[PDB]
Amino acid sequence: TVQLQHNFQAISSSIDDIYSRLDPPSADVQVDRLITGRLSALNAFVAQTL
Amino acid sequence: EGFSFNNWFLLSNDSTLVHGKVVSNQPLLVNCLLAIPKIYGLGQFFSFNQ
Amino acid sequence: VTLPSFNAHSFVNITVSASFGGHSGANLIASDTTINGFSSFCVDTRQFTISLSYNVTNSYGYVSNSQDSNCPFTLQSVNDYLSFSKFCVSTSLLASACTIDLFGYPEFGSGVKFTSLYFQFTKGELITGTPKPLEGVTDVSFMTLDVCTKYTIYGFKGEGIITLTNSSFLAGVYYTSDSGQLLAFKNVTSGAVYSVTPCS
Amino acid sequence: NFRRFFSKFNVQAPAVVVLGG
Amino acid sequence: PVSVDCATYVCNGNSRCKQLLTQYTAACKTIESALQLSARLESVEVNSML
Amino acid sequence: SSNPHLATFAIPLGATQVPYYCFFKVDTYNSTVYKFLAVLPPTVREIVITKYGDVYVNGFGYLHLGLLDAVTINFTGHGTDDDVSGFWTIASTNFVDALIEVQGTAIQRILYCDDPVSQLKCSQVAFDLDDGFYPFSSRNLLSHEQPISF
Amino acid sequence: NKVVTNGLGTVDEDYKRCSNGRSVADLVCAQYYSGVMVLPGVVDAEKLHM
Ligand SMILES: *[C@@H]1O[C@H](CO)[C@@H](O[C@@H]2O[C@H](CO)[C@@H](O[C@@H]3O[C@H](CO[C@H]4O[C@H](CO)[C@@H](O)[C@H](O)[C@@H]4O)[C@@H](O)[C@H](O[C@H]4O[C@H](CO)[C@@H](O)[C@H](O)[C@@H]4O)[C@@H]3O)[C@H](O)[C@H]2NC(C)=O)[C@H](O)[C@H]1NC(C)=O
Ligand SMILES: *[C@@H]1O[C@H](CO)[C@@H](O[C@@H]2O[C@H](CO)[C@@H](O[C@@H]3O[C@H](CO)[C@@H](O)[C@H](O)[C@@H]3O)[C@H](O)[C@H]2NC(C)=O)[C@H](O)[C@H]1NC(C)=O
Ligand SMILES: *[C@@H]1O[C@H](CO)[C@@H](O)[C@H](O)[C@H]1NC(C)=O
Ligand SMILES: *[C@@H]1O[C@H](CO)[C@@H](O)[C@H](O)[C@H]1NC(C)=O
Ligand SMILES: *[C@@H]1O[C@H](CO)[C@@H](O)[C@H](O)[C@H]1NC(C)=O
Numbered sequence: 138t139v140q141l142q143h144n145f146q147a148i149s150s151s152i153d154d155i156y157s158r159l160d161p162p163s164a165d166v167q168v169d170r171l172i173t174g175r176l177s178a179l180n181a182f183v184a185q186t187l
Numbered sequence: 188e189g190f191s192f193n194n195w196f197l198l199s200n201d202s203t204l205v206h207g208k209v210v211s212n213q214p215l216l217v218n219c220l221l222a223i224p225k226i227y228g229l230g231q232f233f234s235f236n237q
Numbered sequence: 238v239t240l241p242s243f244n245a246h247s248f249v250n251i252t253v254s255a256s257f258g259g260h261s262g263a264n265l266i267a268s269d270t271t272i273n274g275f276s277s278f279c280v281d282t283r284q285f286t287i288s289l290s291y292n293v294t295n296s297y298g299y300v301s302n303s304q305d306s307n308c309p310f311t312l313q314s315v316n317d318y319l320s321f322s323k324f325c326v327s328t329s330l331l332a333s334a335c336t337i338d339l340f341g342y343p344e345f346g347s348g349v350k351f352t353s354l355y356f357q358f359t360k361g362e363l364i365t366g367t368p369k370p371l372e373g374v375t376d377v378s379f380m381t382l383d384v385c386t387k388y389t390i391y392g393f394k395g396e397g398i399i400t401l402t403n404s405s406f407l408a409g410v411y412y413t414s415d416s417g418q419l420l421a422f423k424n425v426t427s428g429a430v431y432s433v434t435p436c437s
Numbered sequence: 438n439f440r441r442f443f444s445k446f447n448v449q450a451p452a453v454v455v456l457g458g
Numbered sequence: 459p460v461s462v463d464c465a466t467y468v469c470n471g472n473s474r475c476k477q478l479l480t481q482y483t484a485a486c487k488t489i490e491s492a493l494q495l496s497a498r499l500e501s502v503e504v505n506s507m508l
Numbered sequence: 509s510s511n512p513h514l515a516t517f518a519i520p521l522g523a524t525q526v527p528y529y530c531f532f533k534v535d536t537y538n539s540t541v542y543k544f545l546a547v548l549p550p551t552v553r554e555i556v557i558t559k560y561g562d563v564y565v566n567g568f569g570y571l572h573l574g575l576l577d578a579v580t581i582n583f584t585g586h587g588t589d590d591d592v593s594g595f596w597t598i599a600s601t602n603f604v605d606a607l608i609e610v611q612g613t614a615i616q617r618i619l620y621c622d623d624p625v626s627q628l629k630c631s632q633v634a635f636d637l638d639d640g641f642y643p644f645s646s647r648n649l650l651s652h653e654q655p656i657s658f
Numbered sequence: 659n660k661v662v663t664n665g666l667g668t669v670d671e672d673y674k675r676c677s678n679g680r681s682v683a684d685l686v687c688a689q690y691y692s693g694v695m696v697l698p699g700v701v702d703a704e705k706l707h708m
């Protein structure tokens with residue numbers, strides 16, 4: 138849970154701000170990093186659990 | 188020890204944690220405590236560096 | 238929802254006047270801009286709306302104006318209930334001020350930029366980049382409790398359902414989750430706290 | 438006497454205080 | 459046994475984010491599948507010898 | 509009132525009944541405006557300020573502006589106002605790292621970190637700690653006083 | 659009793675009260691709103707005693 142607050146290289150730890158503040162294309166760009174961070178942490182958690 | 192923090196505010200910079208424990212730098216070192224109950228007939232110039 | 242405060246708006250304009258193109262559309266003539274008629278400005282009113290104005294003409298024809306953004310925001314976004322504890326615009330270099338540039342492309346495409354705009358600002362609910370001078374005496378905030386709704390709770394955008402929670406947290410205003418999610422925010426105007434639930 | 442009871446608290450001379458509770 | 463909608467974890471129901479999630483394909487699906495497969499395995503075995 | 513510059517803050521009301529708009533007048537030669545400090549909250553409990561301009565209100569940094577030097581008071585608490593003063597205690601404060609236990613956004617207990625046992629505790633997250641082997645840093649020079657080598 | 663810091667294993671609250679949302683979200687609600695759901699233990703301690 139605590140992983141997701143880390144603003145993973147993005148402008149913010151939440152997404153709609155990214156959508157609102159900049160044009161969708163760039164907002165997509167930034168959110169990609171958050172997306173990757175979240176899933177990656179999931180992966181590590183998953184492997185640990187397994 | 189024994190102080191109950193009748194009104195003491197933890198210094199949350201944006202949003203306050205409701206419950207838990209946090210290690211942080213807060214001004215808990217006490218200098219020249221003044222506790223005057225319901226009296227201030229004073230024209231005072233509190234100055235730092237002193 | 239932001240801090241209770243006097244209904245105060247100041248229209249931000251920043252007029253940019255330029256002439257490009259020359260002969261065969263590949264030349265330039267002039268370019269300048271001001272923040273509401275001045276080279277710099279700072280918002281004091283709680284509300285403020287940018288109204289970008291353009292006296293930009295290609296001597297050969299039309300000018301395509303493209304926006305640069307070295308800023309956490311866009312001109313179309315700042316008015317969208319963006320919140321600051323301060324916000325200042327300079328036409329010249331300003332320390333720790335994000336950059337927004339404009340590029341004027343004439344019909345034959347000189348490709349030049351407009352003046353760099355520098356925005357030194359700090360987040361807060363003191364002044365709000367507004368789309369329109371907000372209404373409401375002593376408070377411009379509005380909410381729909383028990384309603385799945387958009388919100389900007391002291392800058393906390395999002396979607397959720399607002400339910401009065403009878404809690405009486407003396408300290409703090411809006412408390413976030415352990416996972417950095419705003420769980421309850423106090424009206425503070427009434428000193429009452431509302432829990433927020435994601436709609437889905 | 439209860440004076441030792443109040444002595445238990447770390448304290449210094451100009452500490453004009455009120456114990457409560 | 460633990461479960462999580464990694465789609466929600468990353469997107470939190472944001473459809474605009476949901477499309478972006480989709481392009482990373484089964485990452486989320488595989489994660490959840492591993493979780494549930496494992497968990498149901500333990501469920502059935504522990505119910506077995508019990 | 510909410511306008512010093514359009515109206516007088518000559519208050520026509522007493523004992524609140526209205527969250528009193530707090531405005532903060534700049535008093536320099538080329539700036540003499542009242543910045544809206546804050547709508548008066550229903551009840552303030554504790555206020556803390558810092559050298560570097562931290563106007564901190566009820567767990568919130570309302571201003572936390574550039575460094576303050578003279579925090580001067582003229583609270584007219586004279587005459588019978590000597591029994592009207594809100595000043596009940598004030599304590600000068602130095603920042604210190606400490607672990608805070610809080611519940612219901614209410615302070616419960618504290619633990620400083622200067623002591624090595626306490627240093628380990630605040631280095632950890634729990635006031636109590638278990639008997640075991642714990643990482644620790646060799647004590648550096650307590651006085652920073654780092655010479656420059658170039 | 660000495661080990662279960664929660665007192666009981668039953669403390670895994672039904673997420674329905676989480677969906678209530680009238681009061682402030684708890685840790686269970688924090689993770690649920692994040693998309694996490696802890697499943698009940700496959701068997702209770704009473705069955706283990708049995
Ligand atoms: C809300 O968020 C704001 C964001 O800025 C916080 O503001 C900062 O808070 C920190 C917390 O204390 C301040 O840190 C202190 O800075 C003081 C001034 O900085 C000088 O000194 C330090 C350390 O010497 C240098 O690194 C720096 O370059 C400056 O030269 C210092 O006096 C403090 O240091 C103390 O301890 C050190 C040892 O660690 C001693 O050597 C010092 O002599 C001193 O005793 C401390 O570093 C920081 O200054 C604040 N920002 C600004 C711009 O001042 C708010 O605190 C935060 N919380 C609220 C508002 O409640
Ligand atoms: C938080 O709680 C406060 C406390 O009620 C709410 O403030 C209330 O705000 C409304 C409108 O903003 C006020 O209504 C008033 O009604 C009269 C009569 O119709 C009208 O003349 C006024 O112009 C105003 O519309 C109401 O008096 C006021 N209550 C107070 C000050 O005690 C507030 O709306 C709640 N939410 C927020 C986000 O502040
Ligand atoms: C009030 O301010 C004046 C200067 O503005 C100062 O001389 C005086 O000491 C202060 N206090 C009182 C009680 O007058
Ligand atoms: C700060 O304090 C030192 C020593 O007390 C003194 O020499 C110096 O003049 C002071 N400066 C200011 C600005 O108060
Ligand atoms: C800015 O635009 C607003 C309307 O959007 C107008 O009322 C105001 O006069 C303009 N100010 C300047 C300086 O252009």
Ligand SMILES: *[C@@H]1O[C@H](CO)[C@@H](O)[C@H](O)[C@H]1NC(C)=O
Pocket residue numbers: 252253254255290291292
């Ligand atoms: C045209 O440009 C001049 C200076 O370049 C400026 O004063 C004027 O406001 C501009 N007109 C418009 C409509 O922006």
Ligand SMILES: *[C@@H]1O[C@H](CO)[C@@H](O)[C@H](O)[C@H]1NC(C)=O
Pocket residue numbers: 401402403404680681
């Ligand atoms: C708060 O408690 C009061 C008194 O029991 C009750 O009437 C009210 O419904 C409660 N509200 C919430 C959100 O718990």
Ligand SMILES: *[C@@H]1O[C@H](CO)[C@@H](O)[C@H](O)[C@H]1NC(C)=O
Pocket residue numbers: 537538
């Ligand atoms: C205020 O600052 C401006 C900026 O330089 C200066 O021109 C002006 O003279 C100042 N006001 C005074 C000194 O009264």
